[PDB]
Amino acid sequence: KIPLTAVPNQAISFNAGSSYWKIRLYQNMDMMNADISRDGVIVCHGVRCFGGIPLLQYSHQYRPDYGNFVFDRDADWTLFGDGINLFYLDGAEFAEYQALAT
Amino acid sequence: AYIGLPTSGAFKLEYRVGPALNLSPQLINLMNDRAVGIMPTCAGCDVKVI
Amino acid sequence: MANYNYIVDTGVIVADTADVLSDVEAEFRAALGANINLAASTPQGSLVAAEAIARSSVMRNEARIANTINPNVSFGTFLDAICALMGIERGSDLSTFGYGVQVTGRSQTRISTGSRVQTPAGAIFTVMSDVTIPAGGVATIDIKSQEYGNIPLPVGNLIIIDGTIGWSGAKVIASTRVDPGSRQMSDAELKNARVNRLAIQGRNSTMAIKAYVSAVPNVTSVNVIENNTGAVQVVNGVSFTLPYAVWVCVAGNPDKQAVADALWAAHNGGTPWDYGATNNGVPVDGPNGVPVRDPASGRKYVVKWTTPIMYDGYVNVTVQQGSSSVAPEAIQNAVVNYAQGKVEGEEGLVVGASLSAFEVAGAIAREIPGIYIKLCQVACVAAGSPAPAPGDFTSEYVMSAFGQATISVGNVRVTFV
Amino acid sequence: ALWAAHNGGTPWDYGATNNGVPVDGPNGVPVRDPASGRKYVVKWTTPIMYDG
Amino acid sequence: YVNVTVQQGSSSVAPEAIQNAVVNYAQGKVEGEEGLVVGASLSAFEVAGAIA
Amino acid sequence: YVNVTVQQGSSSVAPEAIQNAVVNYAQGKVEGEEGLVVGASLSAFEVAGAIA
Numbered sequence A: 001k002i003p004l005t006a007v008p009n010q011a012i013s014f015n016a017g018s019s020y021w022k023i024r025l026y027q028n029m030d031m032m033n034a035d036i037s038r039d040g041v042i043v044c045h046g047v048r049c050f051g052g053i054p055l056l057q058y059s060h061q062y063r064p065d066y067g068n069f070v071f072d073r074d075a076d077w078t079l080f081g082d083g084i085n086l087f088y089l090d091g092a093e094f095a096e097y098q099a100l101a102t
Numbered sequence B: 001a002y003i004g005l006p007t008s009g010a011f012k013l014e015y016r017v018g019p020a021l022n023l024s025p026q027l028i029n030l031m032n033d034r035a036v037g038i039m040p041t042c043a044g045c046d047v048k049v050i
Numbered sequence C: 001m002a003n004y005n006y007i008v009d010t011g012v013i014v015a016d017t018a019d020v021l022s023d024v025e026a027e028f029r030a031a032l033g034a035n036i037n038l039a040a041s042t043p044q045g046s047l048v049a050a051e052a053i054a055r056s057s058v059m060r061n062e063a064r065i066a067n068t069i070n071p072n073v074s075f076g077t078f079l080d081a082i083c084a085l086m087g088i089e090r091g092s093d094l095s096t097f098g099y100g101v102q103v104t105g106r107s108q109t110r111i112s113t114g115s116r117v118q119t120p121a122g123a124i125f126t127v128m129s130d131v132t133i134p135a136g137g138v139a140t141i142d143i144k145s146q147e148y149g150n151i152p153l154p155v156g157n158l159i160i161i162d163g164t165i166g167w168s169g170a171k172v173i174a175s176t177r178v179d180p181g182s183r184q185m186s187d188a189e190l191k192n193a194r195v196n197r198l199a200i201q202g203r204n205s206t207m208a209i210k211a212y213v214s215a216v217p218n219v220t221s222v223n224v225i226e227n228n229t230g231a232v233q234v235v236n237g238v239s240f241t242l243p244y245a246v247w248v249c250v251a252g253n254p255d256k257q258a259v260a261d262a263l264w265a266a267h268n269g270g271t272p273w274d275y276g277a278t279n280n281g282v283p284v285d286g287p288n289g290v291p292v293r294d295p296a297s298g299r300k301y302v303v304k305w306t307t308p309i310m311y312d313g314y315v316n317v318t319v320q321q322g323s324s325s326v327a328p329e330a331i332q333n334a335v336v337n338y339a340q341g342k343v344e345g346e347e348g349l350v351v352g353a354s355l356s357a358f359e360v361a362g363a364i365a366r367e368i369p370g371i372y373i374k375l376c377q378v379a380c381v382a383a384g385s386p387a388p389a390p391g392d393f394t395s396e397y398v399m400s401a402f403g404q405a406t407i408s409v410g411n412v413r414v415t416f417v
Numbered sequence D: 001a002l003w004a005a006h007n008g009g010t011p012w013d014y015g016a017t018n019n020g021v022p023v024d025g026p027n028g029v030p031v032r033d034p035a036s037g038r039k040y041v042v043k044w045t046t047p048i049m050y051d052g
Numbered sequence E, F: 001y002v003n004v005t006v007q008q009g010s011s012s013v014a015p016e017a018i019q020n021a022v023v024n025y026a027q028g029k030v031e032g033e034e035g036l037v038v039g040a041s042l043s044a045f046e047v048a049g050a051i052a
Helices: A091-101 B025-030 C017-031 C043-064 C077-083 C189-202 C205-215 C256-265 C328-340 C357-367 E017-027 E044-048 F015-026 F044-051
Strands: A009-016 A019-028 A031-038 A041-048 A068-071 A086-089 C101-103 C115-118 C122-126 C142-144 C167-170 C219-226 C244-250 C309-312 C315-320 C372-378 C413-415
Touching (some): C205 C219, C328 C357, C328 C413, C372 E044
Antiparallel strands (some): A068 A086, C101 C167, C115 C122, C122 C142, C315 C372
């Protein structure tokens, strides 16, 4: 579970799952958007945030053995720290969750 | 109205078209062939349109 | 010059308005003079503001629609991606009714948009203004406020906004009842419709048959095999050249037609069903399973299946009580529960599944330890036959694919040697 | 993968003596099935390596 | 001396796992069966039934 | 006069499209191609590349 705060545009850095991540969250028109980067190399730009579906879409991105991120509900920067969270799942349990998805 | 009960033979398929659709025979002519691939199909089968 | 290539291989980069505003100010300073006044009041400052707003707005608008044919997006475009397969929208109705009941005074008018309430406190509004006959009964038209599939409890209503000398908004069964669609599928259960459709489409005939016929209620087990030749590979299916063989086992099959509907839901468009050479399982009905024509605007078809041949097996046990007390009927119940398959890890005596006294002894061992088992032997015989002789018991019994075994409480006999 | 993408009765076929070398002699024995049955048939070949 | 003839089962059970089953029953580490003591009636039913 | 034999494959294209493409190639709309200047022999391989 990643710490967040109530600001319309921020960036949090952390070292989780034996990898170094940098994430960005910013409001764009109606929905949120996210920028994800690993090891200093950008991964993807502007992934829309939705409740229950993972942020990293593509196999060459999320893992041979890395993790992935899911928002429990739709993002709203006035609610962070109260009812809306961002969680990190390492490879084994993330693959288990993809199995559970269908 | 009567229907073609048997369609005798495994892996043989056809289709039946009414007058209400008023579908042009040009479409029927072009939708038989496999070089376009615009029709459901299954292995072993040959498909007609009428 | 201050332009950026914010569209790259990775995606779209959305800047912050401080940066674009600085770039626009630089552009206008280069246009006019390096010592210009750019504030809110001055006209060129208003031009700067207009230009910055336009640029940031267009960039954000492009960025929002960057990646859309992925099934994550929403709000219309996602609806098109859905209806490329199947999907409906709108569905925002309200249960407008007819034939109300109004008992009021004489020759008086009920003003429109009167408020009507019913027992769990839901608000309903009348539609058309109407007068009252001197007898004291007329009909109105109702509608709610929220666009929901509301259900009215059949009770006399209550008055929220009161007209003059007019009371008792009451029910009637003669009222036409309209069930409204209420915004059923907004954004996320469309994804679940996609998931279900993809899962349905993924399977083959064997997987689809197994899951679909397992989906009917009270079913126990289903064994499906495919001849793949005009010979005998596992069972003598030589009726047709390339049939599919279906055996369905059940504890009674409360719904005969349900299994036929399930079989119809899984048909492969090029294969027959008829199987067996009068030696396999006896089908429920000879020529056809008399289906229902088609749930989706279709005609009448036929489909065939068969059920396994029932059997019943006798088990003997010789046992020493040991150093504790064990009830015999308890042991018999344990064996029967193992036979039904209620113990986790073992599927049970399903269609085409043999039985051996080693498995019964294992069931006893798991269910009740602290017991010494001398000998356990098993036998089988066709359904209804009298008790066979002592010589008919064997260590293991092999069973045909269309055969199914049954064990009863009094069938088992124990000996406390 | 091959057994999971077919559904017909007997679509498997070795071509002839004029074809790519079969990978296995009689069959390919796809042991397990979703129905738990012990069905065993898979037939496929490999190409002929030419040179241009 | 114990011998058994087993089918392939439902899971990939290694043949080395079944050996450790009967050794515990002889040593009496299972819950319910006392073990191999004086006058212990070595039986195939008490053993091969308890391995499951 | 140029004649070309082509298989449509899975995405058929207009004959008029091919003729217009080759014709406006003949003057060299594409980068690096000067066209049918005086004394410049034309080759079917070059038209194949233009199609390519």
